[PDB]
Write a protein that binds this ligand. Structure first.
Ligand SMILES: CCCCCCCCCCCCCCC(=O)OC(COC(=O)CCCCCCCCCCCC(C)C)COC(=O)CCCCCCCCCCCC(C)C
Ligand SMILES: CCCCCCCCCCCCCCC(=O)OC[C@H](COP(=O)(O)OCCN)OC(=O)CCCCCCCCCCCCCC
Ligand SMILES: CCCCCCCCCCCCCCCC(=O)OC[C@H](COP(=O)(O)OCCN)OC(=O)CCCCCCCCCCCCC
Ligand SMILES: CCCCCCCc1cc(O)c2ccccc2[n+]1[O-]
Ligand code: SF4
Ligand code: SF4
Ligand code: SF4
Ligand code: F3S
Lengths: 291, 397, 449, 60, 37
C-alpha cells in the first residue's frame, strides 16, 4: 500500500514529483489521479484554513510528540491488560513499518499518524447525532459532550485514529493526576470517542487573541500569524517534522511545504481530502554501496 | 390471431424502419453503429430474459396471472436462440475482425491489446488485471454458455407445456416443469447477472457494482411485465380469454407491475445511496458520468416519470383493474424503461446529452420490433392458455 | 399434499385452537413449565449481564479500536433479521394470495415482535452511554441540536421504531377477532374483560369485515416495503461506510435474503416442536413444512449468490483492499467463520433441493439449526473480519469476544423464549379466524371441483 | 392522505433540521436539495408509519 | 359505503372536540419547546 513513500535524492533533484508519478503510474497507468467525488465540500477561499504537514524524511520516531500530546490533551493511561485488549489511547501514533527486500534486516519506516481532519470526513457522515462535524476553519469537531458512543466514527475512519473510552480510563481519585490534568482541555468520561483536534485549545486561544487585538486596534478583521499557533506535537518535535499553519495563506510554512511535489495525503482514493499531508521520505544513498 | 397478425406486422415494420435507419447511420459512423447496437441489444434482451424468468416464477408459484400469461411467457422465451444469433455483431465488434467492419478501435476496452498488454500505448493496469476474465474468448464462451442454458431451459419448458396440452398427464407434466423452474431460477439469476456484467459493465472495467445484474433483472422484469400488460390488452378479444380470463389476472398483473416498479427504484436507489454516501473514487465516476453534461435531467426524468408517476397511478385499484388504463400505463412504463437503459448505457459512449445520435433510437426500436415479430409468430403457434393444466382452477377465482 | 387436513369444522377449529389458552393455571403443562423455567433462568442471566454492563462499561466486551462493532452488532443484525420471515408471512403472503400463511402467521408475527424486542435493546445496550439513545431521536431540546439524518443509524432509529410499531399494530389487528373468540370462549367472568377490552366488541359484522379486510390488505401492502426498507437500512449501516468489506452495493437485497433465510430457519425450528406438542398436525402440515423449506432454499440460494457477488467483486477488482479482504476471509485469523459459513450456508442447502429431505422433520430441524449458526457466522464475517484488517496495517488487531457478550446473547435468547412462552400461554399460537375462513375456502374449492 | 402527510413531514423535518435550522458541514455533503439522498429513508419510514396508523385507526 | 356513525348528531361535536384537543396540545407543545426558554 502507498502509505510510506520512499524516494532518492538525485531523481528528486531531477523532478520532485516522481514518487507520486511512479505510484500512480503503477496503480492507475497515469501520472496523476483523477479522483472524482460526489460531494462538494466547503469552499475555504478567504478564511483561516488549518493544516498539518509531517516530514517523513525528518522523523526519527522518538515519541516526544506522543508524550506531548498526552500531556497537553489529558489522554488517559490505560492498563497493560487494556492495551492487550487493543484499547490504547493515543491521539497520535508512530507507525513503524519494516519495509525492505529482506525482512531479517529491513529498513525502518517511522511515521506519525494523527487525525487528518479530512474535509470530506467519513467519520463525520456516519455519526447519528452530529457529535463529529466540520469547522468553518476546516477541523473535524469531535464533541465529547455530544458523543454518545455508537462506535461508528472509528469504523468509518480509514486511519483508525479515533480512540474510545471503553471503561473509566481517566483517573477520578488521584489528586496529583487531577492537578496534572490540563484545565483548558476536557477530561473524557467512559463511553465517549476521542481523537486528534490539531490542539484546538491553542487554535481557539490564538483566534480569540487575534480577534481581541483586531477590535482593540479597530482593524475589523483578525489576522492569525504563521507562528501564532504551535501545536504540542509541533512544539515538542526535536526535528521539526511536524509543521502547523494556514493553508489559504500562501506565505505560510505549511502552504510552502504543501506546494512541494513530494507532499501527499494518505488513501486519496477515499475522497477525504486530508489536511494532514505527508512529505515522502527522500533517501540519499551512495553509489559505492546502493547505486 | 387478427391482433397477433397486427402486432406481428407492426413489429416487422418497426424492425424494417429501425434496421434501415441503423444501416444508414452505419455508413456515416460505423463505431456509433455498434455502440448503439449494444444499447439496442440490452433493451431488446429485457423481454425474453424476463419472459423466461417469470415463466419459471409462475411455474414455481402458480397463479391466475401465471396461467393467463404463461403461453406469452413461453413465446417470449422461445426467441432466445434468435437473440443468441443476434449477439454475433457485438462479438464481431470485440473480436480481432473489428478493422474489416469499419470500427477503428475495438468495441470494449479489454479487447485493446494496447490496454491489456504490458508495454502497450495505454496499458491500463486494472483492465490488464482482468485480462483472462475480460477477454473476447472467455466472454464469448460465457455468453454462448448462457445462451445454451437459456435456450435449453425455454425449449424444455415450452415442449413440456405443449406435450401437456396435446397428450399426457397434466399433473405429472407440471411437477417436472416446477422442478426445472426451481433449478432454473437460481441458474437464471447467476446467468443473467453475469451476462449483464460482461455486456454492460465490461464497457468500463474501472467501475464495478454487485447489485448490477440483479438491477438489470428488476429492469427486465418490469419491462416484460408492462409488455405482458400491453399484449394482454391486445388479445382481450380472442375467444379464449373471453371465457376463462376475468379481471383478477389483470389485477394481479397490475399489482406485479407496481411492485416491480417499486423494486426497480429500490435497486437503483440502493446503489445510488451506497455510492453517494461511501465517497470512494472507484465508484463515484459512474454517477459523475451519469450526472454531467445534461444526464442529470435524464436522471430527474427517471425519478419523476419512471417512479413518481407509475407509483401514484398504479396505487389506485381501478387503474390496474382496467386493461385500457393498464395498457396506457404500461406504454408509458416501457417508454421510461427505454429512457432508463439509455441513462444506463449511453453515458458510456456519448458523454453528452446532445451527443445522442439517431442510431441510438433506431437500434432499440428496430430490435424490439424484431422481438415483437418473433414473439407474435411464436404465440401464433400455440393456444393462448394452458387448458389442460392443474392450475386452470385458479382462473375460476 | 394439502394445507388443511380433512375432518375439521369451524367449532372444532375454534375449540382446538382456543383451548390451549384459557386453561386454568393449575392445568398448565409440565413441558411449558420446564421451558419457561429455562427461559426465566436465561432471563436472569440477561439481567445480570445488563446490570454488569451498565455498572462497568462496554469494555467488558471484546471490542477495541479497529473492531468497534463486534458481537453486539452481530447479534443485533441476527435478532432483527429473525423477524423478516414473520413479517413476510403476515404481509407478503397476504399480498401474494398464498393459502399457507393462515396457520403460521400468528406465531411467526409474534416471533417477529419478540425478535425486534430483543434486537431493539442492542443499540441501547451497545451504545456506550446507554441513557442517551433519545439523542438519536429527533426530539426538542434546549440546545437546538438535531440528529445528523445523513448517517444510517438515524435511518435505523426511524426504521426500527416504524418496524416495531407497525408490526405490533398489525399483530393486534390480526388478534382483535381472536380476542373476540377468546372473550366468547372464556369461562371466568373476570377473564372475559381481559379479552373484551382488547377485542373492543368486534361482533364479526360483515360491514366490519369489509373494512377489516381492506385494512389488512393495505397494512400488508405497506408492511412489505416497510420490512424491505428496514432490512435495507440495516444493510446500509455497513454499506454507507468506506470499509472494504462493507462498501458492497448488493447488501440491501443480500440482507433481505439473509434475514428471510434466518427467519424461516427459526420459524421452522419453532413450528416443529409446536406442531408435535400441540394438536396442530391438521393445521400446520407437511405441505406447510415443505413450502417453508422451499422458501428457505430459495432465499439461501440468493444469499449464496450474494457470496458469489462478493467473491467476484474481490477477484474482479484490482483493489488491494478487496483482494486482502478475500485473502483475510479465506486464510486469516478469523477464517473459521468464513469456512463454517460456507459449510453451513452452501453445503447444507443442497439437501433442501430433495423432496424427501424437504419432507423429513429431523433433517429440517438440523438444517434450520445449522442455518441459524451459519447466519451468525455470516454476520461475524461481514462485521468483525472487515473491521479487523483495514486500510492501514498498523491499525490491525484481532477481535476476541469475552464471556459477557456471550452471556448477553444467551440472555436475549432467554428473553425471546420467555416472551414466546408467555405468548403461547395467554394467546393462541395460530389464527382462529382466517383458518376457519381457509376451511370455508377449501370447502368452496371442493364444491367448485 | 396520511402517507402523503408522513412523507412530506419526514422530508421537511430532515430538510429544516439539517439545512435551515442548523446548517452543519458533515462529510462535505451538500447543504441544499443536492442532499436529496439520505433523506429518502426517513421520509419513507415516516410515510409508512403514518399510513399504517391511518389504516389501523381509520378502520377502527 | 357510508361509515358506521353516519347520521349521528354527536359526530361533528366529537370531531370538533378531537381537533380542538389536537390544536391545543400542538400549541402547548410549541409554546413549551419554542417560546419557553
Ligand atoms: C426508494 C423508495 C421507494 C418507495 C417505495 C414505495 C412503496 C410503498 C407501497 C406501500 C404498499 C401500499 C400498497 C397498498 C395495497 O395493498 O394496494 C392494493 C390496492 O388497494 C388500494 O386501493 C390501495 C390501499 C391504499 C394505498 C395507499 C398507500 C399509501 C402511500 C404509501 C406511503 C409511502 C410514501 C413514500 C408516499 C393492492 O396492491 C398491492 O397489494 C401491491 C403491493 C405491492 C408491494 C410492493 C413490494 C415492493 C418491495 C420493495 C420495497 C422497496 C423499498 C425501497 C421500500
Ligand atoms: C421478499 C421481498 C420482496 C417482496 C415483493 C413481492 C411482491 C409482493 C406484491 C406483489 C403482489 C402480486 C399480485 C398478487 C399475486 O398475483 O400473487 C398471488 C399469486 C396468485 O395466487 P392465487 O390467487 O391465484 O391462488 C393461489 C393459492 N390459492 O400467488 C403467486 O403465484 C405468487 C407470485 C410470485 C411473486 C414473485 C415475486 C418475486 C420477487 C423477486 C424479487 C427480485 C429479486 C432479485 C434479486
Ligand atoms: C426477471 C424476472 C424476475 C425473476 C426473479 C427470480 C428470482 C426471485 C426468486 C423467485 C421467487 C419464487 C419463490 C419460489 C418459492 C416456492 O416454491 O414457494 C411456492 C409458494 C407456494 O407454492 P405451492 O403451494 O407449493 O404450489 C403452488 C402450485 N400449485 O408460492 C409462493 O408464492 C411463495 C413465494 C414467496 C416469495 C418469497 C421469496 C422472496 C425472496 C426474498 C429475496 C428478495 C430480495 C429483495
Ligand atoms: C427508539 C428506537 C431507537 C433504537 C434503534 C437505534 C438505532 C441504532 C443505533 C445505533 O447506535 C446502532 C449501531 C449499530 C447498528 C445499528 C444501530 N441502530 O440501529
Ligand atoms: S516528536 Fe517529531 S521526530 Fe519524534 S516521533 Fe514525533 S514527529 Fe517524529
Ligand atoms: S482522519 Fe479519521 S477522525 Fe480525522 S477527519 Fe478523517 S476520518 Fe475523521
Ligand atoms: S496536533 Fe495536538 S492534538 Fe493533534 S496529535 Fe499533535 S499534539 Fe495531539
Ligand atoms: S459514530 Fe458518532 S456518536 Fe460518537 S462514537 Fe462516533 S462520534
Amino acid at each position: 500500500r502507498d502509505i510510506y513513500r520512499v524516494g532518492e535524492f538525485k531523481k528528486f533533484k531531477e523532478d520532485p514529483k516522481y514518487i507520486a508519478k511512479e505510484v500512480y503510474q503503477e496503480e492507475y497507468g497515469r501520472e496523476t489521479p483523477n479522483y472524482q467525488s460526489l460531494q462538494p465540500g466547503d469552499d475555504y477561499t478567504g478564511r483561516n484554513a488549518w493544516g498539518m504537514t509531517i516530514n517523513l524524511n525528518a522523523c526519527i520516531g522518538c515519541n516526544a510528540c506522543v508524550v506531548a500530546c498526552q500531556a497537553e490533551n489529558n489522554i488517559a493511561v490505560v492498563g497493560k491488560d487494556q492495551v492487550s485488549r487493543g484499547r490504547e489511547m493515543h491521539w497520535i501514533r508512530i507507525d513503524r513499518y519494516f519495509a525492505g527486500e529482506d525482512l531479517d534486516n529491513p529498513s525502518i519506516y517511522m511515521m506519525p499518524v494523527n487525525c487528518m481532519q479530512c474535509e470530506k470526513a467519513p467519520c463525520e457522515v456516519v455519526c447519528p447525532v452530529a457529535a463529529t462535524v466540520h469547522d468553518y476553519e476546516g477541523l473535524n469537531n469531535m464533541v465529547y459532550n455530544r458523543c454518545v458512543g455508537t462506535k461508528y466514527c472509528s469504523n468509518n475512519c480509514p486511519y483508525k485514529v479515533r480512540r474510545f473510552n471503553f471503561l473509566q480510563y481517566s483517573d477520578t481519585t488521584t489528586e496529583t493526576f487531577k492537578l496534572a490534568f490540563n484545565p483548558d482541555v476536557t477530561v473524557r468520561i467512559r463511553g465517549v470517542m476521542e481523537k486528534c483536534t490539531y490542539c484546538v485549545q491553542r487554535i481557539s486561544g490564538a483566534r480569540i487573541a487575534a480577534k481581541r487585538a483586531a477590535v482593540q486596534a479597530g482593524q475589523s478583521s483578525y489576522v492569525i500569524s504563521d507562528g501564532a499557533i504551535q501545536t504540542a506535537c509541533e512544539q515538542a518535535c526535536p526535528t521539526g517534522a511536524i509543521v502547523f499553519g494556514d493553508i489559504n495563506d500562501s506565505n505560510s510554512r505549511v502552504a510552502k511545504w504543501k506546494a512541494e511535489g513530494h507532499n501527499y495525503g494518505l488513501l486519496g482514493f477515499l475522497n477525504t481530502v486530508p489536511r494532514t499531508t505527508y512529505l515522502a521520505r527522500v533517501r540519499n544513498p551512495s553509489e559505492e554501496l546502493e547505486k | 390471431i387478427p391482433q397477433l397478425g397486427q402486432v406481428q406486422m407492426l413489429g416487422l415494420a418497426a424492425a424494417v424502419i429501425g434496421i434501415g435507419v441503423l444501416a444508414a447511420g452505419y455508413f456515416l459512423s460505423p463505431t456509433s453503429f455498434f455502440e448503439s447496437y449494444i444499447y439496442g441489444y440490452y433493451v431488446a434482451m429485457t423481454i425474453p430474459l424476463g419472459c423466461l424468468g417469470f415463466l419459471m416464477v409462475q411455474h414455481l408459484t402458480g397463479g391466475a396471472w401465471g396461467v393467463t400469461v404463461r403461453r406469452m411467457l413461453e413465446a417470449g422465451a422461445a426467441t432466445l436462440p434468435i437473440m443468441g444469433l443476434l449477439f454475433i455483431p457485438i462479438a464481431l465488434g470485440y473480436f480481432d475482425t473489428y478493422k474489416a467492419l469499419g470500427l477503428e478501435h475495438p468495441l470494449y476496452e479489454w479487447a485493446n491489446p494496447e490496454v491489456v498488454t504490458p508495454g502497450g500505448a495505454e496499458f491500463d493496469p486494472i483492465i490488464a488485471h482482468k485480462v483472462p476474465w475480460l477477454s473476447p474468448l472467455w466472454v464469448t464462451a460465457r455468453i454462448a454458455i448462457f445462451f445454451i442454458i437459456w435456450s435449453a431451459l425455454a425449449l424444455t419448458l415450452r415442449a413440456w407445456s405443449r406435450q401437456q396440452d396435446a397428450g399426457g398427464d397434466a399433473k405429472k407434466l407440471a411437477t417436472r416443469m416446477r422442478r426445472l423452474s426451481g433449478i432454473g431460477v437460481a441458474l437464471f439469476v447467476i446467468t443473467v447477472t453475469f451476462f449483464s456484467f460482461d455486456v454492460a459493465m465490461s464497457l468500463d472495467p474501472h467501475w464495478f457494482s454487485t447489485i448490477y445484474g440483479a438491477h438489470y433483472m428488476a429492469n427486465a422484469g418490469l419491462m416484460t411485465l408492462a409488455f405482458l400488460a400491453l399484449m394482454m390488452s391486445r388479445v382481450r378479444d380472442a375467444a379464449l380469454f373471453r371465457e376463462y380470463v376475468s379481471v383478477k389476472p389483470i389485477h394481479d398483473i397490475g399489482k406485479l407491475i407496481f411492485a416491480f416498479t417499486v423494486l426497480w427504484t429500490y435497486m437503483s436507489y440502493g446503489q445510488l445511496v451506497i455510492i453517494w454516501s461511501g465517497d470512494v473514487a472507484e465508484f463515484t465516476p459512474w454517477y459523475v458520468h451519469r450526472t454531467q453534461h445534461g444526464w442529470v435531467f435524464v436522471a430527474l426524468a427517471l425519478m419523476l416519470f419512471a417512479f413518481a408517476l407509475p407509483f401514484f397511478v398504479l396505487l389506485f385499484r381501478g387503474t390496474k383493474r382496467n386493461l385500457n388504463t393498464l395498457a396506457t400505463i404500461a406504454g408509458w412504463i416501457v417508454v421510461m424503461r427505454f429512457v432508463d437503459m439509455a441513462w444506463i448505457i449511453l453515458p458510456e459512449f456519448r458523454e453528452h446529452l446532445w451527443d445522442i445520435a439517431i442510431t441510438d433510437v433506431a437500434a432499440p426500436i428496430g430490435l424490439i420490433g424484431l422481438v415483437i415479430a418473433l414473439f407474435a409468430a411464436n404465440v401464433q403457434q400455440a393456444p393462448l392458455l394452458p387448458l389442460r393444466d392443474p392450475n386452470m382452477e385458479q382462473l375460476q377465482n | 399434499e394439502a394445507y388443511l387436513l380433512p375432518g375439521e369444522t369451524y367449532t372444532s377449529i375454534s375449540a382446538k385452537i382456543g383451548d390451549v389458552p384459557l386453561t386454568p393455571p393449575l392445568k398448565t403443562p409440565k413441558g411449558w413449565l420446564a421451558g419457561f423455567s429455562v427461559a426465566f433462568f436465561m432471563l436472569m442471566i440477561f439481567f445480570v449481564s445488563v446490570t454488569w454492563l451498565f455498572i462497568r462499561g462496554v469494555g467488558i466486551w471484546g471490542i477495541n479500536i479497529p473492531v468497534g462493532w463486534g458481537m453486539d452488532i452481530i447479534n443485533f443484525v441476527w435478532w432483527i433479521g429473525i423477524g423478516h420471515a414473520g413479517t413476510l408471512i403476515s404481509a407478503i403472503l397476504l399480498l401474494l394470495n398464498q393459502g399457507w400463511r393462515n396457520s403460521i402467521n400468528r406465531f411467526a408475527e409474534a416471533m417477529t415482535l419478540f425478535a425486534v424486542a430483543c434486537a431493539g435493546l442492542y443499540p441501547i445496550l451497545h451504545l456506550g452511554r446507554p441513557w442517551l439513545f433519545y439523542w438519536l431521536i429527533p426530539y426538542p431540546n434546549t440546545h437546538g441540536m438535531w440528529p445528523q439524518f445523513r448517517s444510517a443509524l438515524a435511518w435505523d432509529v426511524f426504521a426500527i421504531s416504524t418496524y416495531a410499531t407497525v408490526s405490533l399494530v398489525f399483530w393486534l389487528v390480526g388478534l382483535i377477532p381472536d380476542f373476540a373468540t377468546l372473550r366468547d370462549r372464556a369461562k371466568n367472568i373476570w377473564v372475559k374483560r381481559l379479552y373484551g377490552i382488547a377485542a373492543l366488541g368486534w361482533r364479526g359484522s360483515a360491514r366490519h369485515w369489509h373494512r377489516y379486510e381492506m385494512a389488512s390488505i393495505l397494512l400488508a401492502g405497506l408492511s412489505t416495503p416497510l420490512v424491505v426498507s428496514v432490512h435495507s437500512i440495516i444493510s446500509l449501516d455497513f454499506a454507507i461506510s468506506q470499509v472494504p468489506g462493507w462498501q458492497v452495493t448488493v447488501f440491501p437485497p443480500y440482507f433481505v435474503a439473509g434475514a428471510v433465510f434466518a427467519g424461516f430457519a427459526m420459524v421452522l425450528l419453532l413450528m416443529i416442536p409446536v406442531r408435535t406438542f400441540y394438536g396442530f398436525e391438521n393445521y400446520i402440515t407437511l405441505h406447510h413444512l415443505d413450502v417453508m423449506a422451499k422458501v428457505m432454499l430459495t432465499t439461501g440460494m440468493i444469499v449464496v449468490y450474494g457470496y458469489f457477488m462478493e467473491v467476484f467483486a474481490s477477484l474482479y477488482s484490482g483493489n488491494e483492499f478487496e483482494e486482502y479482504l478475500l485473502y483475510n476471509r479465506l486464510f486469516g485469523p478469523s477464517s473459521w467463520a468464513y469456512w463454517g459459513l460456507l459449510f453451513c450456508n452452501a453445503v447444507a442447502i443442497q439437501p433442501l433441493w430433495f423432496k424427501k429431505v424437504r419432507q423429513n422433520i429431523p433433517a429440517l430441524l438440523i438444517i434450520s439449526l445449522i442455518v441459524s449458526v451459519g447466519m451468525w457466522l455470516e454476520r461475524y464475517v461481514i462485521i468483525v473480519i472487515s473491521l479487523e484488517r483495514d486500510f492501514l496495517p498498523s491499525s490491525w488487531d484481532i477481535y476476541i469476544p469475552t464471556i459477557w457478550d456471550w452471556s448477553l446473547y444467551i440472555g436475549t435468547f432467554g428473553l425471546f423464549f420467555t416472551l414466546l412462552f408467555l405468548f403461547i400461554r395467554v394467546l393462541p399460537m395460530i389464527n382462529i379466524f382466517e383458518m376457519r375462513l381457509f376451511l370455508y375456502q377449501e370447502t368452496e374449492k371442493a364444491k367448485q371441483r | 392522505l396520511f402517507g402523503l402527510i408522513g412523507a412530506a413531514s419526514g422530508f421537511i423535518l430532515q430538510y429544516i433540521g439539517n439545512l435551515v435550522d442548523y446548517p452543519l458541514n458533515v462529510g462535505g455533503r451538500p447543504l441544499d436539495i443536492t442532499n436529496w439522498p439520505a433523506m429518502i429513508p426517513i421520509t419513507f419510514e415516516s410515510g409508512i408509519l403514518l399510513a399504517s396508523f391511518a389504516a389501523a385507526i381509520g378502520m377502527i | 359505503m357510508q361509515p358506521e356513525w353516519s347520521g349521528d348528531p354527536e359526530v361533528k361535536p366529537v370531531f370538533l372536540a378531537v381537533t380542538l384537543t389536537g390544536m391545543v396540545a400542538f400549541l402547548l407543545m410549541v409554546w413549551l419547546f419554542a417560546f419557553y426558554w
